[PDB]
Amino acid sequence: NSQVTVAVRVRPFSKREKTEKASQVVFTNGEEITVEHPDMKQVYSFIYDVSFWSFDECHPGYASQTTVYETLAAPLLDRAFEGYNTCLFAYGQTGSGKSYTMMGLNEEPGIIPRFCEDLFAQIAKKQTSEVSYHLEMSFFEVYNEKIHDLLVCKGENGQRKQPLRAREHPVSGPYVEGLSMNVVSSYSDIQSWLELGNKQRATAATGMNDKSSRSHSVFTLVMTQTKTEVVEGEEHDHRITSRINLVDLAGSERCSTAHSSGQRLKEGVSINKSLLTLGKVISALSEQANGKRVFIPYRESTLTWLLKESLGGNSKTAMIATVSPAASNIEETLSTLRYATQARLIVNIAKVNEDMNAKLIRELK
Amino acid sequence: LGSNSQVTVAVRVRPFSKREKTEKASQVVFTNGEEITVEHPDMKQVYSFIYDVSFWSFDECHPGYASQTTVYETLAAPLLDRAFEGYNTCLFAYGQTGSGKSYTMMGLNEEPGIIPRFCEDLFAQIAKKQTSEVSYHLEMSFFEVYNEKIHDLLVCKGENGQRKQPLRAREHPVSGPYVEGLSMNVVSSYSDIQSWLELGNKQRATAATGMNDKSSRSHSVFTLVMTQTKTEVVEGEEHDHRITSRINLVDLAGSERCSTAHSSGQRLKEGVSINKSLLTLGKVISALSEQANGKRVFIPYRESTLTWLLKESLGGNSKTAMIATVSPAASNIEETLSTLRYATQARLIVNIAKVNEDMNAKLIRELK
Numbered sequence: 001n002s003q004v005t006v007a008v009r010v011r012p013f014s015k016r017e018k019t020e021k022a023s024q025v026v027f028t029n030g031e032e033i034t035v036e037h038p039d040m041k042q043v044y045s046f047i048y049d050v051s052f053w054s055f056d057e058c059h060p061g062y063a064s065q066t067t068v069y070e071t072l073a074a075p076l077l078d079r080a081f082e083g084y085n086t087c088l089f090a091y092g093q094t095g096s097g098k099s100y101t102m103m104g105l106n107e108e109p110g111i112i113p114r115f116c117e118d119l120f121a122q123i124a125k126k127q128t129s130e131v132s133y134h135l136e137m138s139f140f141e142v143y144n145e146k147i148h149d150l151l152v153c154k155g156e157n158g159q160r161k162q163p164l165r166a167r168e169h170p171v172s173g174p175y176v177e178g179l180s181m182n183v184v185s186s187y188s189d190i191q192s193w194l195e196l197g198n199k200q201r202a203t204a205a206t207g208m209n210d211k212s213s214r215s216h217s218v219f220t221l222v223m224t225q226t227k228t229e230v231v232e233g234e235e236h237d238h239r240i241t242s243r244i245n246l247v248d249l250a251g252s253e254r255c256s257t258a259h260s261s262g263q264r265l266k267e268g269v270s271i272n273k274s275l276l277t278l279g280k281v282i283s284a285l286s287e288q289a290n291g292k293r294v295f296i297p298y299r300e301s302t303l304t305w306l307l308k309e310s311l312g313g314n315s316k317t318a319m320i321a322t323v324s325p326a327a328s329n330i331e332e333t334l335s336t337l338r339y340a341t342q343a344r345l346i347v348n349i350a351k352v353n354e355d356m357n358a359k360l361i362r363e364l365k
Numbered sequence: 366l367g368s369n370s371q372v373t374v375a376v377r378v379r380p381f382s383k384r385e386k387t388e389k390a391s392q393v394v395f396t397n398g399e400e401i402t403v404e405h406p407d408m409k410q411v412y413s414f415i416y417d418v419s420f421w422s423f424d425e426c427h428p429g430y431a432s433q434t435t436v437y438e439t440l441a442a443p444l445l446d447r448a449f450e451g452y453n454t455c456l457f458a459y460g461q462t463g464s465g466k467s468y469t470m471m472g473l474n475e476e477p478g479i480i481p482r483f484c485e486d487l488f489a490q491i492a493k494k495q496t497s498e499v500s501y502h503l504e505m506s507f508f509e510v511y512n513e514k515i516h517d518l519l520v521c522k523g524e525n526g527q528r529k530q531p532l533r534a535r536e537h538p539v540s541g542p543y544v545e546g547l548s549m550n551v552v553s554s555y556s557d558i559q560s561w562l563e564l565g566n567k568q569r570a571t572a573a574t575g576m577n578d579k580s581s582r583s584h585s586v587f588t589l590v591m592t593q594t595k596t597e598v599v600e601g602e603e604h605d606h607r608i609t610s611r612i613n614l615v616d617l618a619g620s621e622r623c624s625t626a627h628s629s630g631q632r633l634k635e636g637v638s639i640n641k642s643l644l645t646l647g648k649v650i651s652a653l654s655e656q657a658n659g660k661r662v663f664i665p666y667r668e669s670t671l672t673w674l675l676k677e678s679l680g681g682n683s684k685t686a687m688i689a690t691v692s693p694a695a696s697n698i699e700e701t702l703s704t705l706r707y708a709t710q711a712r713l714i715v716n717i718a719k720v721n722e723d724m725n726a727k728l729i730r731e732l733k
């Protein structure tokens with residue numbers, strides 16, 4: 001089997017929201033995230049695999065950064081050190097708390113640095129001069145189904161981002177023609193590459209934020225593990241490689257509540273199509289794991305086509321969604337809750353928790 | 366509702382008037398202590414009546430003289446006791462013109478009536494039981510009925526040829542009838558009560574007539590709302606059990622024949638309205654007294670604003686007391702007889718009073 005671990009991070013209230021007294025609409029009951037519109041009408045309920053209640057630091061089950069890491073990412077490291085492939089998707093709207101979860105701040109670090117440093121630590125523990133490791137990484141983006149390299153020195157002129165193309169190797173699967181790769185030995189030599197890429201990544205000001213993401217981003221870390229057998233015959237030939245993919249996805253963005261035209265419209269359509277195809281892929285993989293063999297439409301998008309070998313077979317996939325609990329963003333949070341979901345979401349009416357002043361059926365009983 | 370509180374009736378004989386001394390009127394009402402005997406001056410026929418209480422303010426030095434404070438300490442103080450217990454209470458006057466209803470209820474500056482003593486005793490009792498467990502909240506209103514319209518006495522008018530803004534009455538399904546828009550003022554002390562009362566009595570309508578040079582030509586209802594917020598022994602929130610009580614003190618106008626107090630126009634109009642209201646009240650009293658004897662009877666509450674707003678006091682849910690005021694002059698023997706007959710008919714009324722815990726259908730209900 002190869003299942004898909006879907007998870008959700010409920011951001012806590014920010015200072016602006018506490019000052020405006022923006023009321024809470026996303027609540028938890030443990031194994032369920034519930035949405036109760038302030039009108040107290042159709043109450044939505046979603047059952048995921050893992051729920052991260054980062055809402056209030058004193059509530060039971062408080063999802064710290066270390067908690068989230070040990071919950072989702074570390075099994076991907078343990079899997080990578082077995083010779084299998086791993087993929088971590090990050091989805092969320094802007095302001096929902098996605099970068100906090102993936103990257104982190106100067107303090108309270110996130111999945112990216114935690115995974116990197118724990119990886120290097122386990123590498124050091126497993127170094128013997130009988131077993132060796134090599135780490136090579138790349139970082140690229142997808143924009144209107146065209147691939148661009150993020151680690152390339154570029155000047156200022158018109159239409160400078162030269163598009164690369166995907167190609168299918170019969171054994172190794174799909175790849176990008178002309179994409180650069182760079183060798184690493186720590187995290188301090190990853191940070192300066194990521195900071196070079198995230199400045200070339202496409203952005204544009206919109207009704208949601210003046211600096212939003214408008215292109216999918218893939219950071220791929222390729223590990224090669226070399227072994228040697230003591231039979232005096234297998235000279236540095238036992239090779240096994242693994243790929244860890246970390247994919248920052250852009251938001252859906254409805255073109256109805258944002259009157260747009262031209263390039264922003266095109267970007268939204270492309271992003272939307274990519275997300276739809278990714279959802280089809282994840283659902284079909286879930287069905288495959290539950291037994292019924294199906295056809296995965298990998299080929300309907302550059303992202304899925306390039307990530308084909310990292311979302312199938314003997315592999316591990318995780319999808320971290322990030323949602324905000326404020327009532328000011330019902331449509332986006334529900335859009336992000338309806339998206340990241342493999343099972344069936346249930347809806348009811350639950351304004352009848354006010355039967356008689358904290359029901360008090362204790363009296364009736 | 367496990368009770369039956371009988372309406373408590375009193376009678377007060379006022380002294381001879383200037384008018385009734387100018388006309389050489391005789392004495393026809395007498396007492397033997399607790400009973401009240403009335404005699405026609407023709408020496409033809411005698412009647413007797415018996416009440417729960419009877420007062421005798423005919424002469425200062427006579428035996429049994431029931432002064433203003435004695436009337437208070439006999440009637441109004443138990444109503445304050447029940448108000449502190451948690452019951453709604455009502456005290457209303459009745460009588461012919463010039464009987465002395467406004468005097469008995471409000472009084473003069475040198476002889477305060479029942480209201481300035483009730484409110485003062487209330488605040489004084491509070492000052493001894495305002496401990497840490499229980500707090501108190503007091504609101505007041507004071508409204509008027511004039512030509513079947515409702516007016517507020519505790520506002521300062523504008524200045525126009527017409528500055529009597531009429532309110533309307535409504536029927537809440539649970540709380541019963543009430544007045545829409547009535548200024549309910551939060552009170553702190555007896556001095557504030559007195560200020561509001563002065564303003565209201567200065568705003569109330571009056572006029573000179575042939576039987577009262579300062580006549581009470583409008584019905585007046587004085588409402589107090591007292592909320593005692595007490596505390597249980599709690600692991601959480603204190604001050605979590607409240608009891609409410611409404612005290613309604615009512616000064617009504619007198620019958621008044623149009624020929625005796627000869628005056629035309631607005632005086633006649635408002636006298637007619639007064640007469641109509643009194644008729645409807647009499648019908649209500651008779652119908653309740655007939656209910657008390659086991660018959661199926663319909664109470665005409667809706668035929669007048671007065672009874673409509675007092676629906677919960679003449680019957681319903683509150684402890685009620687009536688004060689009939691009579692004159693000993695022989696010239697008014699018929700009206701004295703009518704008043705006394707309605708009063709003794711009122712003793713048969715039985716109201717179902719309950720405590721306003723505001724805990725029934727909440728927790729004390731199934732607790733007990």
Ligand SMILES: Nc1ncnc2c1ncn2[C@@H]1O[C@H](COP(=O)(O)OP(=O)(O)O)[C@@H](O)[C@H]1O
Pocket residue numbers: 011012014054092093094095096097098099100101
């Ligand atoms: N677990 C958390 N606790 C407190 N604040 C958080 C948490 N997660 C996210 N945030 C807040 O979210 C903000 C990041 O939002 P932003 O990065 O603009 O959205 P996005 O990640 O979608 O671009 C941070 O300023 C941070 O204060």
Ligand SMILES: Nc1ncnc2c1ncn2[C@@H]1O[C@H](COP(=O)(O)OP(=O)(O)O)[C@@H](O)[C@H]1O
Pocket residue numbers: 379380422461462463464465466467468469577579580581619
């Ligand atoms: N017990 C009493 N002692 C002295 N005066 C009285 C007494 N009862 C009535 N009066 C006199 O009767 C007059 C009219 O009383 P009032 O209450 O205004 O009658 P109404 O029922 O018309 O309001 C007052 O001026 C008052 O002096």
